[PDB]
């Protein structure tokens, strides 16, 4: 399927506004499980539940364990670019 590049702008006091599940230890990609109303992902648009996150800010998430992805994702700030594909 199509790999979309999706932009999200986040203030430092805000979260991304997504929940993720999956990861290498489960044999699946990092997958979006929820988009939280009113937070940056919802406001900015373009992400959806069931998307596999292939990269964030050019950092590859394809073979990451869940906790690794949580770390990388949580460290991104400001203007953030996701690369995602719906699975």
């Amino acid at each position: 399927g199509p790999i979309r590049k999706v932009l999200l702008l986040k203030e430092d006091h805000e979260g991304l506004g997504i929940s993720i599940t999956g990861g290498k230890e489960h044999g699946v990609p990092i997958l979006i499980s929820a988009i939280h109303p009113g937070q940056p992902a919802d406001r900015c648009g373009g992400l959806h539940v069931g998307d596999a996150i292939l990269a964030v800010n050019g950092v590859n998430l394809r073979d990451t364990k869940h906790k690794e992805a949580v770390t990388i994702l949580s460290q991104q700030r400001g203007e953030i670019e996701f690369e995602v594909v719906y699975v």
Partner: peptide, 10 residues
């Protein structure tokens, strides 16, 4: 394949 996956809000 695991039946249980963590789910983390970010």
């Amino acid at each position: 394949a695991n039946s249980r996956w963590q789910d983390t809000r970010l």
